[PDB]
Design an enzyme around this catalytic site. Structure first.
Site, PDB file in Angstrom:
ATOM      1  N   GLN A 173       0.831  -1.193   0.000  1.00  0.00           N
ATOM      2  CA  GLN A 173       0.000   0.000   0.000  1.00  0.00           C
ATOM      3  C   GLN A 173       0.876   1.258   0.000  1.00  0.00           C
ATOM      4  OE1 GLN A 173      -1.505  -1.264   4.070  1.00  0.00           O
ATOM      5  NE2 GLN A 173      -1.700   0.968   4.252  1.00  0.00           N
ATOM      6  N   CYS A 194      -5.130   0.340   3.362  1.00  0.00           N
ATOM      7  CA  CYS A 194      -5.287  -1.055   3.787  1.00  0.00           C
ATOM      8  C   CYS A 194      -6.697  -1.622   3.615  1.00  0.00           C
ATOM      9  CB  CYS A 194      -4.838  -1.242   5.244  1.00  0.00           C
ATOM     10  SG  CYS A 194      -5.249   0.123   6.306  1.00  0.00           S
ATOM     11  N   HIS A 203      -5.837  -1.494  11.579  1.00  0.00           N
ATOM     12  CA  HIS A 203      -5.187  -2.024  10.369  1.00  0.00           C
ATOM     13  C   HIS A 203      -6.061  -3.105   9.798  1.00  0.00           C
ATOM     14  CE1 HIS A 203      -1.939  -2.507   7.547  1.00  0.00           C
ATOM     15  NE2 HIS A 203      -1.766  -3.781   7.857  1.00  0.00           N
ATOM     16  N   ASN A 219      -0.916  -9.529   4.436  1.00  0.00           N
ATOM     17  CA  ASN A 219      -0.767  -8.087   4.664  1.00  0.00           C
ATOM     18  C   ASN A 219      -0.436  -7.354   3.346  1.00  0.00           C
ATOM     19  OD1 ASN A 219      -0.653  -5.710   6.145  1.00  0.00           O
ATOM     20  ND2 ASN A 219       1.282  -6.233   7.170  1.00  0.00           N
TER      21      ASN A 219
END
Lengths: 212, 5
Positions: free
Chosen positions: A19, A25, A159, A175
């Site tokens: 990102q 995110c 997150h 992630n």
């Protein structure tokens, strides 16, 4: 549900993304779930556009954060383009969905996982990748290099990521910090213990797309 | 909800 699930091995997960210096995110998280449900339902793995969600979901706040469930509703009630058509730029710009022709994929809805409930989250993961949230501000999460991550961390989620599998002692998370972070961009977060919030608040707020 | 690295 079985002891192991790994959507990567079923060809339902695309490469790890970055990102960058943008709090997008939430859009990355939503896209992982869309890429997953499209593969499961149609047999095709494609990349879809985080940038479109960043530019177009105005309930969210662009590079200042946002809501995976809001992004997922946009795809069902509007739609989403391929990543190639609407690639990631790392800055919020105007919504270009109309300019880029008809949508590539559409979902038929969004559902929430029962919160603070490990089995409910695992059951969902056994069916498809799931958008999840966690507390990532701690140095322990930021500096994670591999292994089963147990924390330390609190439950103050900040997150958005995606769960793409699990095994005996962990939930497997994709992630969006690039492939250098964690285990090739993934984290295995400890599960199973006596913790209703989950490690780093992992069970706080989890969604998945519905199709078809 | 929701961090940059």
């Amino acid at each position: 549900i079985p002891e192991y699930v790994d959507w990567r091995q079923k060809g339902a997960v695309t490469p790890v993304k970055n990102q960058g210096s943008c709090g997008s995110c939430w859009a990355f998280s939503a896209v992982v779930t869309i890429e997953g449900i499209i593969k499961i339902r149609t047999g095709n793995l494609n990349q879809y556009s985080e940038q479109e969600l960043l530019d177009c979901d105005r309930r969210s706040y662009g590079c200042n954060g946002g809501y995976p469930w809001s992004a997922l509703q946009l795809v069902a009630q509007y739609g989403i383009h391929y990543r190639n058509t609407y690639p990631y730029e790392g800055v919020q710009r105007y919504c270009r969905s109309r300019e880029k022709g008809p949508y590539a994929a559409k979902t038929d809805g969004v559902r929430q996982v029962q919160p603070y409930n490990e089995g409910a989250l695992l059951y969902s993961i056994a069916n498809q990748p799931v958008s999840v949230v966690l507390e990532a501000a701690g140095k322990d999460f930021q500096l994670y290099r591999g292994g089963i991550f147990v924390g330390p961390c609190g439950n103050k989620v900040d997150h958005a990521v995606a769960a793409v599998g699990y095994g005996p002692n962990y939930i497997l998370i994709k992630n969006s910090w690039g492939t250098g972070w964690g285990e090739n961009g993934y984290i295995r977060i400890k599960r199973g213990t006596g913790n209703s919030y989950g490690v780093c608040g992992l069970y706080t707020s989890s969604f998945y797309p519905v199709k078809n | 909800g929701g961090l940059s690295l």
